[model samples]
Target: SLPDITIFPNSSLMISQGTFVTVVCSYSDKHDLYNMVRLEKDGSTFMEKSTEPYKTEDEFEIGPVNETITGHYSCIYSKSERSKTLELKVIKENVIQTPAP
Candidate 1:
């Protein structure tokens, strides 16, 4: 069976709009095999890469984000295992959000 896999940069993220963001999916593939890692947003596959075992890690780096990119993010290991969801909260860069009383 595939070993336990995990992601990085906390389970949740809150960042200003138009800021660069990078999320990493990492695992210890003891068997040293060829596989792939996929990054997704809201369950939709965005990017993927082929990986080799050796503390294998995949990074999903994106730039200048907007509201559309704000949602649950996760990773898939070789289409076999899926990581936990990581909530992403995006706020406007210039606009101030004032809470109602």
Candidate 2:
């Protein structure tokens, strides 16, 4: 059976462009040590690993983000354990100009 999986962001889901955000994928410890974990974006795997066999989680960070980084993300473990997808929205940052005082 597939292990329970969970995905979360280190901060708010809505963020401004050109910032960094960390997305984490966590699974139950009941999974096998050799099970591989993968981080997927828009149904494609962007990162995968077999690190820390004892660890139940993995994370991927997007730095200096852009609109292209905004999409649905999820995680899969042991080829079967899949987590619910989450949406990440990146918006252009607003610049404010102050009058010379």
Candidate 3:
């Protein structure tokens, strides 16, 4: 069986540009501890590294998220001959608002 992954805000929440945001990555199976998490954007790579063992939670923050910071993201846990992946996409100004006078 494969491990289950869950991301907060469903990856659809709109955030203000330059605002700080945190991503919570977790898996259902404890054995999935030996895995790596990565963040990517607009055909460019932002972050990629192996996660600590037995750690269910990992966090990433962007001082100021911008249009160029939007892209698809995924997670994969691999060991010996097993692995898994998660897919997500980010966008700029995902939410609309009224202009101030």
Candidate 4:
């Protein structure tokens, strides 16, 4: 049986200066496989990823963090008989601070 759908860790962190960040996506069981997944930013296309049959886990990452990197990400999964989706947000911070007069 397919377990409850979920994303691990919920939230992640990246260096303020700039760094790479990755999100781990998974399902309850093999049912999670046989589908295609992608990460979308604010309804905009960002990354598309796919995995082999029976693959239950996938990772999506953003490199060289920038302003554009900040946005909500949703994962779409399509299977033979059904499809599902998940949404999450990536939060970034600046390492340097502007000096106030």
Separate clash counts for every candidate: 0, 0, 1, 0
Instruction: Encode model 3's per-residue lDDT on 1-101: one tens digit a residue.
Output: 99999977474455567777676555556636466665544334466567666566656677676665555554444442222323333344556688999
What ranking emerges by TM-score with the best candidate at the front?
2, 1, 4, 3
RMSD to the true structure for each prediction, in A, is 8.3, 8.3, 8.0, 8.1
Q: Compose the digit string of candidate 4's lDDT tens values, residues 1-101.
A: 87797767554333342667676656546544546666666766577677545557668877766666765665555553222334433455446888999
Model 3 poorest 10 in a row by lDDT: 80-89
Q: All candidates' TM-scores?
A: 0.71, 0.71, 0.52, 0.56
* lDDT of candidate model 1 versus the reference: 0.77
Whole-model lDDT, model 2:
0.77
Q: What stretches of model 4 exceed 4 Å from their correct place?
A: 1-17, 30-33, 52-54, 80-101
By summed lDDT, the worst window of 10 consecutive residues in model 1 runs over: 26-35
lDDT of 4: 0.58
Candidate 1 lands at a TM-score of 0.71
For each candidate in the order shown, give its overall lDDT on alpha carbons: 0.77, 0.77, 0.54, 0.58
